[PDB]
């Protein structure tokens, strides 16, 4: 038969490649050598809108002349001063190791490994909660509801990510969705596999129904993982 | 076209010089056996290879 | 007109020649005005013009004669007061 959208996306064609030139750049922390054992002051110069980020971004100039781009926390003020390091005071916008962050605090942009730059809690309006601190690990509750253990030296920023509530309003128009998805080059509009020909989809056929259960095994080969992949259950939970 | 490169212009010039009839003195010298050459060309009918 | 002049980056003017023929003159648009580095307000004493016009002028006819000509008067005074107090 013919290929699937997911199969074609793996070849990195311009139809699926992200346009990483309209964006402002990646937001990674400064190298760990500066931040560890030292605390640096920085000034917020500008807050602007990143085409594909789901959150606003901000420019910071540090006392050592280094300029960086960060995810702006909610309530951040242009022209204010922030601190990065172990001795940074506990305030919104400050980055410091998880060992120095008291429990019950909201954090974001947590480093998976000390110095990796931050992977967790970066979407707009999201935050994580510090649960417990131990000499060898810090427990943090993530937006998905999971309790994950991080190395005590991992860095995180105090506050919540700006841009929350974005899903309160409707996308009223197909054109609104068109612009939203064209901003990042996501495949839109999307087709329904049940309305394709049998050559194209496992559910394709003249009749617009799936001829087989829609729960596919986790061991199925590529070109077959469609529908509900390795689903523990389906339907509405009462 | 209004804007041309020199190499293409020179090739077109060579083709233009090529496009001409056989000399009458050549015809009489050859005794009417040579009356034409394969490079004759009409601009609106036969187009250049380039 | 030529495709290059079909662009809207050129401003076009219709003029009538002394010989009685109408001609189309194309000119390049002038740049914007300088803005303060800190607050972004327009500056004073800095004429607008393309590079050739800017080079047509002397040094003292293209900026004000006061320290920090890149800032508006509030910002200039504020920065100097802060610097003096810090010193």
């Amino acid at each position: 038969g013919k290929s699937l959208i997911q199969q074609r996306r793996g070849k990195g064609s311009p139809t699926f490649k992200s346009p990483s030139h309209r964006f402002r750049g990646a937001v990674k922390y400064i190298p760990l050598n500066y931040t560890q054992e030292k605390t640096l002051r920085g000034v917020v110069e500008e807050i602007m809108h990143d085409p594909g980020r789901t959150a606003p971004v901000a420019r910071v100039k540090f006392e050592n002349g280094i300029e960086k781009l960060i995810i702006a926390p909610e309530g951040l003020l242009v022209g204010q001063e922030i601190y990065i390091g172990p001795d940074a005071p506990i305030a919104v916008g400050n980055t410091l190791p998880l060992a120095k962050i008291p429990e019950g605090t909201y954090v974001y942009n947590i480093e998976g490994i000390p110095g990796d730059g931050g992977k967790y809690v970066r979407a707009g309006g999201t935050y994580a909660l510090v649960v417990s601190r131990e000499p060898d690990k810090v427990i943090v509750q993530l937006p998905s509801g999971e309790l994950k253990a991080f190395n005590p030296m991992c860095r995180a920023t105090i506050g919540v990510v700006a841009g929350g509530g974005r899903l309160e309003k409707p996308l009223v128009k197909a054109g609104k969705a068109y612009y939203k998805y064209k901003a990042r080059n996501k495949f839109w509009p999307t087709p329904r596999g049940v309305k394709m020909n049998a050559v194209n989809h496992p559910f394709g056929g003249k009749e617009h129904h799936p001829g087989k259960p829609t729960t596919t095994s986790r061991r199925a080969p590529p070109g077959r993982k469609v529908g509900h992949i390795a689903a523990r259950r389906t339907g509405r939970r009462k | 076209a209004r804007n041309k490169p020199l190499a293409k212009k020179l090739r077109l010039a060579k083709a233009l010089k090529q496009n001409r009839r056989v000399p009458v003195w050549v015809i009489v010298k050859t005794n009417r056996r040579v009356l034409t050459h394969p490079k004759r060309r009409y601009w609106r009918r036969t187009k250049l290879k380039e | 007109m030529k495709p290059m002049y079909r662009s809207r980056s050129w401003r076009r003017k219709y003029v009538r020649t002394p010989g009685g023929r109408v001609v189309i003159h194309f000119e390049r648009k002038k740049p914007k005005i300088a803005h303060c580095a800190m607050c972004g307000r327009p500056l004073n004493g800095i004429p607008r013009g393309r590079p050739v016009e800017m080079r047509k002028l002397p040094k003292t006819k293209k900026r004000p004669e006061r320290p920090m000509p890149h800032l508006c008067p509030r910002c200039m005074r504020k920065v100097m007061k802060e610097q003096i107090r810090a010193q």
């Binding site: - | 293409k8 090739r11 290879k49 380039e50 | -």
Partner: protein, 61 residues
Amino acid sequence: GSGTATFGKRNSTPTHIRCRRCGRVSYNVKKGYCAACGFGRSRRLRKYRWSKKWKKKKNAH
């Protein structure tokens, strides 16, 4: 569509132009290689055994 009216849009940049190496009008201009001799893609000539074109040149077929 697909017929007479379609051929009127052949006024754009030609796909192939003259090749400096082999002298044939087969130089893919947008991609930057010759579809006959491989100029701009390989140092050695593009020669294939299933092709009689390079034998026709020297009447060696």
